[PDB]
Nucleic acid binder design. Structure first.
Lengths: 113, 131, 84
RNA sequence: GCGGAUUUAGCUCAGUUGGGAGAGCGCCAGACUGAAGAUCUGGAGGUCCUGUGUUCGAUCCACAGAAUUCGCACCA
RNA sequence: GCGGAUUUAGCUCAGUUGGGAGAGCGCCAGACUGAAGAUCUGGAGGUCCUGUGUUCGAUCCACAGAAUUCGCACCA
RNA sequence: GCGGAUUUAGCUCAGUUGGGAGAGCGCCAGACUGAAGAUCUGGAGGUCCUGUGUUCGAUCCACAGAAUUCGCACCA
RNA sequence: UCAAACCGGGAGAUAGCUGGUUCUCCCCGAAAGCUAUUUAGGUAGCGCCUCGUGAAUCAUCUCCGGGGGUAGAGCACUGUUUCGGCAAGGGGGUCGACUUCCAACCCGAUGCAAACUGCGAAUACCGGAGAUGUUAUCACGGGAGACACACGGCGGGUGUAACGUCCGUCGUGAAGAGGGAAACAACCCAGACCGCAGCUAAGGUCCCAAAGUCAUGGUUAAGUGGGAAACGAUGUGGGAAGGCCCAGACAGCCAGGAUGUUGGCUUAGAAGCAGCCAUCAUUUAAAGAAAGCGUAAUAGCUCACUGGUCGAGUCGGCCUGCGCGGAAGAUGUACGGGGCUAAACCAUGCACCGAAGCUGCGGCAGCGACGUUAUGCGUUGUUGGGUAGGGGAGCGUUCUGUA
RNA sequence: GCCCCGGUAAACGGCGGCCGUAACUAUAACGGUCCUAAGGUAGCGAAAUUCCUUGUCGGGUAAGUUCCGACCUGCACGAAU
RNA sequence: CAGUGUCUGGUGGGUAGUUUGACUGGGGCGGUCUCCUCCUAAAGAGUAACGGAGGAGCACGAAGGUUGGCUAAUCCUGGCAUCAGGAGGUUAGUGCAAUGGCAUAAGCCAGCUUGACUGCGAGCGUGACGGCGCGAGCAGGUGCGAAAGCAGGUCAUAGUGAUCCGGUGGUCUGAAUGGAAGGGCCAUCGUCAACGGAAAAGGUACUCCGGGGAUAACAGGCUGAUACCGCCCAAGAGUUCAUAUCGACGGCGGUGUUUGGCACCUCGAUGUCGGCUCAUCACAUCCUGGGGCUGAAGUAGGUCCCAAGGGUAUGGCUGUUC
RNA sequence: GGCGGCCGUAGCGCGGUGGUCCCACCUGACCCCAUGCCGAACUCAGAAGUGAAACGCCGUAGCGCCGAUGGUAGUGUGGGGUCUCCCCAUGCGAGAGUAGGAACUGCC
């Protein structure tokens, strides 16, 4: 078969679909950082938390740093464990290393994922 | 005889050529032939030149079928020699109901006499059609 | 050096392909059927090719690609006996 | 009979972008030389095999015919 | 028909590291000689058979075609 | 396979006090001759097979490898 | 007897080379292809045939779930291919513009492909359920033959083509007899124990020849009774379509074909009528500046055109059936013959003749199935053709035993 | 013995392409220029050795693919082959 | 002195034994006899011919792997080398024949790196048969990656060969022990490409023989392009006048006497060529007979039609059929 | 704009209209961090200025692709005649032509 548009952008992953689990997308905006636990067959979002929602707790500083990226990971994962999900794969479409995505993943594990 | 076309050697030239008539107005008259047959360019010229040499009164005489099928012969021994391009040059394929020569003309038929002369030069009983 | 003589495809002998693994019987995760080489994706019964459709079935086994762009090279989604 | 080549100004020949007819020799004249010779220059000299056809126009295409030459063919 | 060789500037020929087109003779001019000759020097002179396919590029490769030549084959 | 010989400037070769790289021929130039020739003189021309080792330093020693030649060995 | 003796022995030399060899009956009953081979007038291994033993219960059209892209068709790659218009390049002719020709591109109309294709069969094919078939399906072992086929049909590839080569599917020739086709390996029907009766198949029903010289209707005349072609055909029959028809026309006969003008040009001359161009108008129901004959050129004579008189359907065109022309040859000419006009041909129909086919009685057998100790009975299936080959029973002969 | 050198042919052999000249034209004849050294000098031809060939001219004959003589580029003449 | 006996090297058909292949519209010459890929093969599979087109008998440490960035041909515009812009699924490129695959790529550029690891199984090649190959696991462990994972060489299908013997890596092995020299197990390399693998040239009109013509060289048969003849249309020629006569281009046919083709038949043998002698048959009539046309005044001819009844017949050179 | 559902007729071209909530463009590079030669990439920060690339809506169907109503060639399979060839029975049915579709649905 031919390579789909999504495959050409390699943003998706067919190898994680052969297993039959969920993902852990990490969206990043020059102002806020988002994270989600989406399941196959469309855009099924089970749990999600924004850095802007971290303010609801007691966030004072900017929400576009590394320490904020780790705070969101603990929130999204904490809500995930409350949902009923245990395992999850990291899906960071287009990004470097040691960045804020790694801090989000390291935070997800800290919760129990 | 499988329809042969290109990717072959260069043979002879078209004994035919003069399309004749003015190509400013497209019509739908004709001279149909009842029956399929292979006509070589050498014959088409005789028939075409016969009517054109008769329709000196006017023009608008056109032909739709051109010779495109190559036919070779092997004049020699046998074992060696598939077929060269000799007298047997391009040959046209005519269908049981195909219009060869159609002259753009309204009921003033002075070409029926012309088509008659040509009808006696090509092998196959042809009929004059007004439509 | 180059290639010439305006020609099309190039020929040789007879094809060396078979129809191993009709599938409705057991089958270890391996190349089901044979025709052309190098291809992956299908990990179970995934007979799907342009046409009236295609199939395979029953056999619980992790993975099991096809031959290549032939008898349903596309990779469908899982399938086992009914109750392995 | 068959097949191939050849058929341009007197002679020997060139000449296919189809659209100029040309060269050498020869002939005549000029120049030169005492002069004649040679050489240089100039001029004249063509149904460019014949007919028909093909194109706007053909030596230069097609078809037919004729002649020359060669190979071949048939001999109470 | 088969097989082989050959097909470069007017003539005769060289020219395979595929990337310069060249030699002899001839022709024209110069040098020289009283001069002509010879010799020496210089210049001009090439669809390097044709087409196509090759490589970045081919006279120099492949394929197809044509011509020349030789052997063979055919020949009431 | 084995042993012997050989492996210097384009060619043919000398060169073991280990400490200069050289000769003939050839090539270029000079001198000479009218000139060309010959002879004479001058110049250019060397990873002195390759690597490593040995010495203060090696073409000139040791070791290893390569090439040439030769004898021998092998060859259903 | 010699480009080289005879005899016997080794010898029953060897050969991938040729040929072949003696009783009866019963059951079943091939391959001429694939791979390798100094291999292709050879073998080995398989496919295929047969026999023996073992095991134990299942095989198959149609529907459903699938694989294919060949036919056909078409154009989106690709390689070809008609015309018009526009722009750019090159060459030639007269002027730095225009005209002509050639090649490439774009747009609207024109054409193609065995190694093209957006499409796409039928159809062949894998597997699974619903018939048929049963110790089959299958496993092991013994013995094979065999690797020069051919023909018809369908689909082919090559070739001008072939009682052509070379493939594929299938049915046959080979073991298809019987019947028809005049005679005839593969064309049609059809496939056999013996004897007997009956009915049919093919074909046939005037006679030879068994059966109607049958029924209704129509056509052909040629004896066509069919090589016989491309081609031709008012020989003749049938069917359909257009137009013209009782304002009597279309053809006879009478009388009539002019005026400018001998149209012009040209030409020795051309004055309707050599040729070159035109082909108008004046006077009427009607006459072309003239369709032919004719003159040296005129003249003269007809025609076209119209009236009088003479008096009914005609004319143009399309299609079909059968016959005819085209068809020239070898010791006497024909459908099997006689012969026939229907005992031809076409559209229908009725009644019969006609096989070892189908039905039926009796009889022999064999094989297999069921039950059985049984190859004894009962019942059941096929029914029972066979070259090569496999399996099995038997009669007769010689001599030697016991009774 | 061989490599190497040399004597020996009473062993196998070779003898082209071009230019000028000349001729009414084509050829042969002579010299050279080039390639590979030479390019056939002294002698000999369509000959039982020449295909094309009844080669060309001619004698001879009414007529001779015969013969004789000449020319001769002699498909593959030549000195004790 | 050598002779003679023995041995060694060289020369050595003088003599002897053999080989000198197969395929092959006969044989020979030419061309082939391993292997890969399209058509042919007629939509599964398999399938032939000196069947049509074309190649492999190697090359490569990178033309391998991964990652980052990037995307091509070709055309247009501003300056054919280069630079800037636009159009552009892709016709580029990807080692090698061809098809197939691919572009935020399996292509280009750059950097980095280097899995071509060891051991052992299951499966794949109708219908059994080895080496070899490939797809897919497991056990342990190399390389790269975060990891899944990816390698058993180069995207896939050509680049290859036995036994014997020799040379190369642990062990086993000969009255009794030590030394040396041997034999063997497993594996790699070296040759048979007439490539499922013999070491070997020529003459035969001096010939001999076995057999045969499933593979040719005649006659027959089919075909008929060639050959012979006819017909249709008829340009044109013939002073004028197509058709007295001649008659192109093109088209359609008959014959089968020629030649070519195929090779279906014969191939278990029917004495050659020419001539001569003698018998019968046929016609595409060269006349005689009766006619048509004419470029037919007459005469003499030219051409054509019906017709074969008869007559159609001979000589000189040459064996010769022109 | 946020937040769902169904979840390949949404390829590829083209037209009108609206939002200063949301969102990229944009702007600025102090620093984390980063470019073999270039904060362009990469990463961080602020919001001056638009909607021009997006997006919300909505209008053409060109061309691609997926369905539907009308029909002849073409083509299996089994008997008929006929010089070849054609015909009948039975299962289906090219391309051209007329139309359909340019998202759907709930909540703030």
């Amino acid at each position: 078969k031919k390579s789909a548009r999504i495959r050409r952008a390699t943003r998706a992953r067919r190898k994680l679909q052969e297993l039959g689990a969920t993902r852990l997308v990490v969206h990043r905006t020059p102002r806020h950082i988002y994270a989600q636990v989406i399941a196959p067959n469309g855009s099924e979002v089970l749990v999600a938390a924004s850095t802007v929602e971290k303010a609801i707790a007691e966030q004072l500083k900017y929400t576009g740093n590394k320490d904020a990226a780790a705070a969101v990971g603990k929130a999204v994962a904490e809500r995930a464990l409350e949902k009923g999900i245990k395992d999850v794969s990291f899906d960071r479409s287009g990004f470097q290393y040691h960045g804020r995505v790694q801090a989000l993943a390291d935070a997800a594990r800290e919760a129990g994922l | 005889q499988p329809k042969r076309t290109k990717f072959r050697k260069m043979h002879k030239g078209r004994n035919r050529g003069l399309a004749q008539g003015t190509d400013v107005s497209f019509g739908s008259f004709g001279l149909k032939a009842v029956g399929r047959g292979r006509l070589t360019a050498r014959q088409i010229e005789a028939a075409r030149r016969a009517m054109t040499r008769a329709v000196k009164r006017q023009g608008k005489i056109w032909i739709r079928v051109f010779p495109d099928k190559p036919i070779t012969e092997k004049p020699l021994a046998v074992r060696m020699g598939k077929g060269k391009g000799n007298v047997e040059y391009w040959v046209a394929l005519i269908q049981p109901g195909k219009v060869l020569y159609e002259m753009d003309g309204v009921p003033e038929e002075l070409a029926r006499e012309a088509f008659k002369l040509a009808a006696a030069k090509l092998p196959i009983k042809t009929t004059f059609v007004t439509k | 050096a180059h290639k010439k003589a305006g020609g099309s495809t190039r020929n040789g002998r007879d094809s060396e392909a078979k129809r191993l693994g009709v599938k409705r019987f057991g089958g270890e995760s391996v190349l089901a059927g044979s025709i052309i080489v190098r291809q992956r994706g299908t990990k179970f019964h995934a007979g799907a090719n342009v046409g009236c459709g295609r199939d395979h079935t029953l056999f619980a086994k992790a993975d099991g690609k096809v031959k290549f762009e032939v008898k349903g090279p596309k990779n469908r989604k899982f399938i086992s006996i009914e109750a392995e």
